[PDB]
Design a protein around this ligand. Structure first.
Ligand code: DGD
Ligand code: CLA
Ligand code: CLA
Ligand code: CLA
Ligand code: CLA
Ligand code: CLA
Ligand code: CLA
Ligand code: LMG
Ligand code: BCR
Ligand code: BCR
Ligand code: STE
Ligand code: STE
Ligand code: FE2
Lengths: 30, 34, 37, 33, 115, 82, 65, 36, 341, 28, 38, 505, 30, 32
């Protein structure tokens, strides 16, 4: 259970990276 | 005029005819002795 | 490319909130004995 | 008593995950006006 | 007993000592409760089947009714037109008062008997 | 309000209705009576008569215990009463 | 709408929306095949059920040799 | 067409059911099924 | 006009008993299921399958007659009249339990026919199909109890027999063998059935006691007109009453009547799931924590342990006669019994 | 066997009786 | 190799076909005589 | 706005985002498969396929990989117990990894189809509106299905280009992955004949190719298009759910009754093998054969393989479980270590007595010993005071032949009773209850859990079918009935034909 | 731990009753 | 490994509760 938990948390972080980069709020000039 | 024989007539008799027959058979059963 | 026209807002009113929470809490109250066993 | 120790996390997620779903939907409904 | 398994204990002992299942007043209770659930679903489904179109496919139909509106929200004649054909005409209520009195009376009287 | 069949209340208060059914109803009743009083019901359905559940010195049930020989088992049991 | 090379190649396969054959078309032939398949499923069911018993068809584990 | 009054049809039919049903309760105490 | 369309015309004529295309499936199957039950309960024994009398002819009354299940030795045979068991002999077919499969299978196709009729009439009249949808619950109960349940077990023998007392025995079997009262899916069924009856009673009473005075008579039924557009009772006063009595009330008539559909239909669906589990003996029979404690601590006693003793009594005392094919012989000394009784 | 006609006779006779009494209107 | 039960299967199959064919023969007949007037 | 129960209806007229959602679902499912397999690999003990096979260990996807030919681990073991195997890439581990990689690839394609939803392919060239030609899509996909079905049968299952499938002898003793030749005769419809599975896939695949070709080229008849609302994708959902619950009932039944595709070394025995004493008869058959060729009792029973004896034990009957008794079978009765031997009971007059076995229905069962003729000769009494048949009074002993206790005899009543309590369960095994802190209460097997899940899902998908079929045929009144529906259409006799306003009288 | 869980859920239900009664969405006419 | 069994629920709740808080705030920000 503890191995699963550590890998789960790590996998969520990688997913977060994906969204943070490709689905960021785009910076707009104005 | 009114028709005599209808789908309704059939549905009614489909049930009524055997009901009376069964009722007579079940009446007779009350006099069976062992 | 135009934005997607099929997007719709979703709603849950307060009464539905209360009904849904009650359902979940009562379900939990019912099944928890069986989960602990 | 010797209960299944996983019954606790099972119960906690069974309550938490659906409840949070409904709260999320309710609060974003209110802030629409 | 005031408890879930205590209730079942009471039911089982009752059956051993009184053969409640073979007692007509309990049989009437079952008819009151099974029949009550039946007519609950029937009435809910017939009114639901005949709601008048007041909304779009993207919103709950419940928003077609507004609390305290004067007009009925379903078409009882259409409900009767469906239910009378499902069985036959005279087995379906067209009088909403008699209908709702029947809904009240069937389970109440069944549960009186089982009590 | 009506689909064109004749009203029931009109039919069952009619003279002709009861001319026919004062015959047909008792006739059907008597037919069903005789179906039983003659013993025919027993033979058609295979239902034991009060003297035919057990053999005289027998308190074993003639329970069918094979699927494909079941027909023959029943027949074997019946011959144990002749 | 966005055109793509793959889309241009697949295009004809999604070009006849709503096109029908007139009247009943092949409906009578479909009915035949449906009926055959019903009998065939009946057979298969009744073999499994041991209501249909066929020579050399031992419906048992003991058919694994 | 409407010759026999329906209240008479209902009384005679009604009595006819009381009779058959009565017979069936009688038979609970006589013969087969009576425990005797 | 093609022949198919002319048959459609005829099937869909407005008559005293609507027929429809669904009628071709419904009417023969329903009448055969019903006729099989009346035939069997009047004339047919259960001697060779069960060791029981079960017909009026044999001396049974309305409470004890049944069409009983086939013998365990038949397994799950379709028991067709022309099949290998009865071999076309009607008499033996009756004695082997064929009327049971006959009623169950015709009954199943009759239930399909009836739900198709609900669809068909709803489409013709122009209403929404919610009465058909609601009827899925009775269907799920029928198939799960009369078909799926015996199919997971050894044979049709253990399905319910079609009779009043025979069903009573089925209830008691489920208590003693499956501890069915402890099953959360049955519990949800109980709540939906008892909840439905409550909704039925409380809604009918509410309407009848919030009526508008729409006529001068002391009999208030006369002051309703099926074509009036006005509501015949006050939702507003109803809502106030219940809000002040109970704390909450309905305010939306549509939600109210959908809820009335929802509660009993959902409850029945939930009970069906539990019975699917019992097909496999996948019971909610025990609580492991309770058993571990009770085995170790002879002073520990709960209503749960008390009810298992009752189940144990049920099983040992009913099994030999209820399962005659097993040839159970339990000498007096092995029967569980409390003191004196 | 003989019991089958004993049973079936009131049926056929009742059927015949209704046939006679109704034939004129069935025609229409 | 045409066993008793395969024979019974065919009996059941023909019986059913007779029942459905007879039923539909009768419904077609009635529908053709007693049409709706439009 | 949309109520919560309708949020996914925004895809109904959006083929690209529908594809995206379907891709995401496919990614999730493939991801589960890889995840489940890795968890099972991390927990599976491969060291004893005899008394600790996969189905005792709560393995669920392991048997499906083994069924189609995946039998070894990169770690060097195989499920048949052979060691030093080299499976190549298609080990359990490689299958799991492939599914995880597949999941990741599907996830990326889901993102692309979600963003680039407005593809011209999805637009009707006449009208400019999103449209899917469902009749032709069906022919395309059916043709593909038929091709894959055929290839699976013709290459994978035959071993022409593939591994074959799991086959065994009738007593589940010698299973292995083997190529299987098609059975084209009537025995191919026998659920227990593996060659029928091969012929099915070849023949049905050809039929699917042909039907597919038909459905690509021939348009639906007008009458059927309109009747089934073939312009409405929800009619496909309705019929597809119907096909799926049909399929789910079939696999539930064949899992429960057994067939060539649900072999007992991968899923455990069936309950019917206990009901019919299937394994006991074969055991007795072999012992009687050893004896009539001059073997000792000890020799005849010692020749019974432990794997066969373990099947003849109610703890492996899948109908002995409970809904909330979780985990592997090992958690209940323990990890089987050894057959103790065949217990033979005799009374003080040397007569052999037989323990009446527990039927699956009973959570508890009394201990009754009979003679060869079914006559009760000993029991464990409940009330002692009028006891006639006690082990103490009848002088019951127990002797063991074969197994760990071979040639031992026990005579002290408490010990003899203790083995008779265990003999109601069938053959007697030594269990390790400490390793898993086993609680002593029977659990069901993967055969039971699979059947339960699939019978329940099938029943629920029947409601889905009714719901979406209703929605398809009554689309026009989903939101309510016609406000201008007049009493003439629903009152009786106005129209000769119900709902047809052209048949007014 | 199991006792705590049962009483916790029960207490949440009682709290929900409070909000549902006193903080309901008010029914408003026409 | 003989880890603390309450570790699992502590970790799960440590992640879930704060994360749910943020998600609730974000979603209702987007819908106005
Ligand atoms: C909802 C919508 C409702 C609409 C439904 C409308 C009604 C449709 C009517 C359908 C009629 C159902 C037929 C059921 C017959 C059946 O199954 O009959 C059972 C037979 C199998 O027969 C049984 O087989 C058992 C196992 O035998 C096997 O195992 C033994 C080992 O000891 C021996 O080796 C033996 O030779 C070998 O054959 C025993 O022998 C039983 O006595 C014998 O009855 O299967 C077969 O016919 C076929 C089995 C595979 C097909 C799957 C059937 C799907 C239905 C079941 C799904 C529920 C699953 C329940 C699990 C819970
Ligand atoms: C809607 C009508 C309906 C339906 C659905 C059923 C359904 C059923 N009945 Mg019931 N039945 C009905 C009407 C119906 N019945 C009527 C009206 C009667 C009174 C006669 C009965 C009397 C009856 C009995 C007495 C029994 C059943 C039984 C059964 C079951 C098996 C049926 C079977 O195997 O069919 C098989 C047949 C078909 C499926 C027909 C398919 C048609 C084929 C494809 C066409 C054949 C082509 C032809 C032969 C070629 C012609 C060539 C020529 C030149 C030679 C099933 C539950 C049995 C039962 O309940 O078991 C317990 C049973 O014993 N039925
Ligand atoms: C508070 C007491 C209580 C309540 C309210 C219930 C309620 C219920 N029980 Mg439980 N039960 C209880 C106590 C109770 N039970 C106890 C103490 C026990 C002992 C353990 C049981 C044992 C028990 C068993 C063994 C079963 C239930 C089942 C059910 C469900 C029945 C659903 C239904 O209507 O079936 C009625 C049947 C149908 C709806 C089927 C279709 C019927 C068709 C439409 C009939 C058409 C008839 C025809 C047209 C006319 C016939 C005419 C003829 C009569 C003359 C329901 C959830 C059943 C269940 O869970 O099923 C899933 C079930 O099998 N109960
Ligand atoms: C030489 C040619 C050949 C051969 C040898 C086979 C061999 C086989 N076929 Mg294939 N088949 C072929 C050609 C062939 N097929 C062709 C050309 C087609 C047309 C594309 C098919 C279509 C086909 C189908 C559709 C099925 C088979 C199945 C089978 C297997 C039958 C044994 C079994 O387990 O049945 C078990 C299955 C049944 C007995 C059918 C059960 C029918 C149920 C009872 C219908 C009612 C369900 C209902 C919704 C239940 C709800 C209520 C319930 C709870 C009471 C066997 C592998 C069956 C299978 O895959 O089994 C796993 C199956 O379902 N075949
Ligand atoms: C790309 C190829 C591919 C391959 C070679 C495999 C191979 C495997 N998978 Mg993976 N899988 C894949 C893609 C693949 N998968 C994808 C895309 C997904 C996401 C959906 C998954 C999800 C998945 C799951 C969830 C699981 C597997 C499992 C498995 C194993 C068992 C397969 C099995 O029993 O299938 C059985 C397949 C069937 C019984 C399919 C029946 C199809 C029906 C009958 C068709 C309906 C009829 C048709 C439409 C029309 C018929 C017309 C006819 C006339 C021809 C095997 C190692 C299992 C495993 O062990 O995981 C570790 C498992 O549990 N896979
Ligand atoms: C088809 C589905 C399927 C099947 C048959 C199995 C089968 C199995 N699994 Mg697997 N598993 C699956 C899916 C499945 N799994 C999935 C999706 C996951 C990811 C979560 C897992 C994760 C998993 C793990 C991690 C483990 C297993 C294990 C096992 C074994 C023990 C199962 C057990 O104790 O169940 C217990 C089942 C229950 C207690 C039933 C639950 C009943 C639910 C909660 C009822 C809910 C009702 C609902 C709330 C009512 C509301 C309705 C209405 C009012 C609105 C068994 C062989 C175990 C094992 O032995 O592995 C080696 C193990 O440790 N499984
Ligand atoms: C392939 C299967 C399939 C597909 C693609 C759909 C698709 C759809 N359904 Mg149907 N449905 C299905 C099966 C399917 N359904 C089945 C089996 C049932 C019976 C349970 C239903 C019953 C049903 C109803 C009653 C309704 C729909 C509705 C809808 C639409 C809206 C769904 C939505 O937004 O849900 C949103 C759902 C959620 C946000 C949360 C659902 C949470 C559930 C309760 C538990 C979670 C399950 C969990 C993730 C595990 C799932 C895996 C499981 C398969 C093992 C959509 C077109 C609705 C509709 O018609 O709108 C017009 C509608 O009212 N469906
Ligand atoms: C996604 C969100 C997930 C969060 C929501 C989670 C809510 C929790 C879900 C409830 C789970 C209840 C399981 C409690 C048991 C537990 O704690 O033990 C945990 C058990 C594992 O069992 C453990 O096994 C261990 C060795 O592996 C040891 O033996 C432990 O002693 C034993 O407890 O978990 C399961 O096996 C889970 C998988 C079950 C899957 C079966 C599905 C088949 C049933 C079909 C259900 C369909 C019914 C639909 C209803 C309609
Ligand atoms: C099975 C079978 C079949 C069929 C059959 C049929 C179809 C039958 C029917 C039958 C029927 C159809 C019957 C009927 C009966 C009836 C009855 C028997 C009734 C009774 C009643 C009563 C007793 C009542 C009473 C009362 C009361 C109690 C109260 C109120 C009033 C009254 C009066 C109502 C066939 C041939 C195909 C073949 C196979 C088998
Ligand atoms: C991105 C990418 C990648 C990666 C990927 C990954 C990493 C994946 C993963 C995935 C996974 C890892 C997934 C999984 C999934 C899972 C799931 C999907 C689950 C489900 C579940 C469920 C649904 C459950 C349910 C239930 C419960 C809970 C209870 C009991 C009952 C039931 C069973 C119902 C790669 C590298 C390839 C490449 C590139 C890209
Ligand atoms: C009802 C009509 C009375 C029923 C008969 C009561 C029979 C008791 C007397 C007897 O049968 O010996
Ligand atoms: C779908 C509609 C099905 C209709 C079924 C009607 C069935 C009537 C059949 C009665 C015939 C029984 C003949 C028995 C002869 C059996 C001979 C044999 O088993 O080899
Ligand atoms: Fe109402």
């Amino acid at each position: 259970m503890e191995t699963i938990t550590y890998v789960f948390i790590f996998a969520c972080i990688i997913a977060l990276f994906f969204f943070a980069i490709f689905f960021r709020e785009p910076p707009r000039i104005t | 005029s009114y028709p005599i024989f209808t789908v309704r007539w059939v549905a009614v008799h489909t049930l009524a005819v055997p009901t009376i027959f069964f009722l007579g058979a079940i009446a007779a059963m009350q006099f069976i002795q062992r | 490319m135009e934005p997607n026209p099929n997007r719709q807002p979703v709603e849950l009113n307060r009464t539905s909130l209360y009904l849904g929470l009650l359902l979940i809490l009562v379900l939990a109250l019912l099944f928890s004995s069986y989960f602990f066993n | 008593m010797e209960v299944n120790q996983l019954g606790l996390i099972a119960t906690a997620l069974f309550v938490l995950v659906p409840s949070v779903f409904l709260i999320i939907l309710y609060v974003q409904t209110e802030s629409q006006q | 007993p005031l408890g879930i398994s205590g209730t079942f204990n009471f039911m089982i002992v009752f059956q051993a000592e009184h053969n409640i299942l073979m007692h007509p007043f309990h049989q009437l209770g079952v008819a009151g409760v099974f029949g009550g659930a039946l007519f609950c679903a029937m009435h809910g489904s017939l009114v639901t089947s005949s709601l008048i179109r007041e909304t779009t496919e993207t919103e709950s139909a419940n928003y077609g009714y507004k609390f305290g509106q004067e007009e009925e929200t379903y078409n009882i004649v259409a409900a009767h037109g469906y239910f009378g054909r499902l069985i036959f005409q005279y087995a379906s209520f067209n009088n909403s008062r008699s209908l709702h009195f029947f809904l009240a009376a069937w389970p109440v009287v069944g549960v009186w008997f089982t009590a | 309000g009506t689909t064109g069949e004749r009203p029931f209340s009109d039919i069952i208060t009619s003279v002709r209705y009861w001319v026919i059914h004062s015959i047909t109803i008792p006739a059907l009743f008597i037919a069903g009576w005789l179906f039983v009083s003659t013993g025919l019901a027993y033979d058609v359905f295979g239902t034991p008569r009060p003297d035919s559940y057990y053999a005289q010195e027998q308190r074993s049930i003639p329970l069918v215990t094979d699927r494909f020989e079941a027909k023959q088992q029943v027949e074997t049991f019946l011959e144990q009463l002749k | 709408a966005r055109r793509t090379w793959l889309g241009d190649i697949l295009r004809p396969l999604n070009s006849e929306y709503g096109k029908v054959a007139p009247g009943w078309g092949t409906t009578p032939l479909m009915a035949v095949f449906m009926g055959l398949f019903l009998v065939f499923l009946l057979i298969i069911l009744e073999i499994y059920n041991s209501t249909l018993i066929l020579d050399g068809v031992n419906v048992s584990w003991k058919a694994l040799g | 067409g409407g010759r026999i009054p329906l209240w008479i049809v209902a009384t005679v039919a009604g009595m006819g059911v009381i009779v058959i049903v009565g017979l069936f309760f009688y038979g609970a105490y006589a013969g087969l099924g009576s425990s005797l | 006009r093609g022949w198919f369309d002319i048959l459609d015309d005829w099937l869909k004529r407005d008559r005293f008993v609507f027929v429809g295309w669904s009628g071709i499936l419904l009417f023969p199957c329903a009448y055969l299921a019903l006729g099989g039950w009346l035939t069997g309960t009047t004339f047919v024994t259960s001697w060779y399958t069960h060791g029981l009398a079960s017909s009026y002819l044999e001396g049974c009354n309305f409470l004890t007659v049944a069409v009983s299940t086939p013998a365990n030795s038949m397994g799950h045979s379709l028991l067709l009249l022309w099949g290998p068991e009865a071999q076309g002999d009607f008499t033996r077919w009756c004695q082997l339990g064929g009327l049971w499969t006959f009623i169950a299978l015709h009954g199943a196709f009759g239930l399909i026919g009836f739900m198709l009729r609900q669809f068909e009439i709803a489409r013709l009249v122009g209403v929404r199909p919610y009465n058909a949808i609601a009827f899925s619950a009775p269907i799920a109960v029928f198939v799960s109890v009369f078909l799926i349940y015996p199919l997971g077990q050894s044979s049709w023998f253990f399905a319910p027999s079609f009779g009043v007392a025979a069903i009573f025995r089925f209830l008691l079997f489920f208590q003693g063998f499956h501890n069915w009262t402890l099953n959360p899916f049955h519990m949800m069924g109980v709540a939906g059935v008892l909840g439905g009856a409550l909704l039925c009673a409380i809604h009918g009473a509410t309407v009848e006691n919030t009526l508008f005075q729409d006529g001068e008579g002391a009999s208030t039924f006369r002051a309703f007109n099926p074509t009036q557009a006005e509501e015949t009772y006050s939702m507003v006063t109803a809502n106030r009453f219940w809000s002040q009595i109970f704390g909450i009330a309905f305010s939306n008539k549509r939600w109210l009547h959908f809820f009335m559909l929802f509660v009993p239909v959902t409850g029945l669906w939930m009970s069906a799931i539990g019975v699917v589990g019992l097909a496999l003996n996948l019971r909610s029979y025990d609580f492991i924590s309770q058993e571990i404690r009770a085995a170790e601590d002879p002073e520990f006693e709960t209503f749960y342990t008390k009810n298992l003793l009752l189940n144990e009594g049920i099983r040992a005392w009913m099994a030999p006669q209820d399962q005659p094919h097993e040839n159970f012989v339990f000498p007096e000394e092995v029967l569980p019994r409390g003191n004196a009784l | 066997d003989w019991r089958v006609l004993v049973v079936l006779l009131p049926v056929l006779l009742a059927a015949g009786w209704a046939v006679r009494n109704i034939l004129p209107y069935a025609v229409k | 190799t045409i066993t008793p039960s395969l024979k019974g299967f065919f009996i059941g199959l023909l019986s059913g076909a007779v029942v459905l064919g007879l039923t539909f023969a009768v419904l077609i007949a009635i529908s053709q005589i007693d049409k709706v007037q439009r | 706005g949309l109520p919560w129960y309708r949020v996914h209806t925004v895809l109904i007229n959006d083929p690209g985002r529908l594809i995206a959602a379907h891709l995401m679902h496919t990614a999730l499912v493939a991801g589960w498969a890889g995840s489940m397999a890795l968890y099972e690999l991390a927990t599976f003990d491969p060291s004893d396929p005899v008394l600790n096979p996969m189905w005792r260990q709560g393995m669920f996807v392991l048997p499906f990989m083994a069924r189609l030919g995946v039998t070894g681990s990169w770690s060097g073991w195989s499920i048949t117990g052979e060691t030093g195997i080299d499976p190549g890439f298609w080990s359990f581990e490689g299958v799991a990894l492939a599914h995880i990689v597949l999941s990741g690839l599907l996830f990326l394609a889901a993102c692309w189809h979600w963003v680039y939803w407005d593809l011209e392919l999805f637009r009707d060239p006449r009208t400019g509106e999103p449209a899917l030609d469902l009749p032709k899509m069906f022919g395309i996909h059916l043709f593909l299905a038929g091709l894959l079905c055929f290839g699976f049968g013709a290459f994978h299952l035959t071993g022409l280009f593939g591994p074959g499938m799991w086959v065994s002898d009738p007593y589940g003793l010698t299973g292995s992955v083997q190529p299987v030749a098609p059975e084209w005769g009537p025995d191919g419809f026998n659920p227990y004949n593996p060659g029928g599975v091969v012929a099915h896939h070849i023949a049905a695949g050809i039929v699917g190719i042909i039907a597919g070709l038909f459905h690509i080229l021939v348009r639906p008849p007008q009458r059927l298009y309109k009747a089934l609302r073939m312009g409405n994708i929800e009619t496909v959902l309705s019929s597809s759910i119907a096909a799926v619950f049909f399929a789910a009932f079939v696999v539930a039944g064949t899992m429960w009754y057994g067939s060539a595709t649900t072999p007992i070394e991968l899923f455990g025995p069936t309950r019917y093998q206990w009901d019919s004493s299937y394994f006991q008869q074969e055991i007795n058959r072999r012992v009687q054969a050893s004896l009539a060729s001059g073997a000792t009792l000890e020799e005849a029973w010692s020749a019974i393989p432990e794997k066969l004896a373990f099947y003849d034990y109610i703890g492996n009957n899948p109908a002995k479980g409970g809904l909330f008794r979780t985990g592997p079978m090992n958690k209940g009765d323990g990890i089987a270590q050894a057959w103790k031997g065949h217990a033979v009971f005799r009374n003080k007059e040397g007569e052999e007595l037989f323990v009446r076995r527990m039927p699956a229905f009973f959570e508890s069962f009394p201990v009754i010993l009979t003679d060869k003729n079914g006559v009760v000769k000993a029991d464990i009494p409940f009330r002692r005071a009028e006891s006639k048949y006690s082990f103490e009074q009848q002088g019951v002993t127990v002797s063991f032949y074969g197994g760990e206790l071979n040639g031992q005899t026990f005579t002290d009543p408490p010990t003899v009773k203790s083995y008779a309590r265990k003999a109601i369960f069938g053959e007697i095994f030594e269990f390790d209850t400490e390793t898993l802190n086993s609680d002593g209460i029977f659990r069901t097997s993967p055969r039971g859990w699979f059947t339960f899940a699939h019978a329940v899902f099938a029943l629920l998908f029947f409601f889905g079918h009714i719901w979406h079929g209703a929605r398809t045929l009554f689309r026009d009144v989903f939101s309510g009935i016609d406000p201008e529906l007049s009493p003439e259409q629903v009152e009786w006799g106005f129209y000769q034909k119900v709902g047809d306003v052209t048949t007014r009288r």
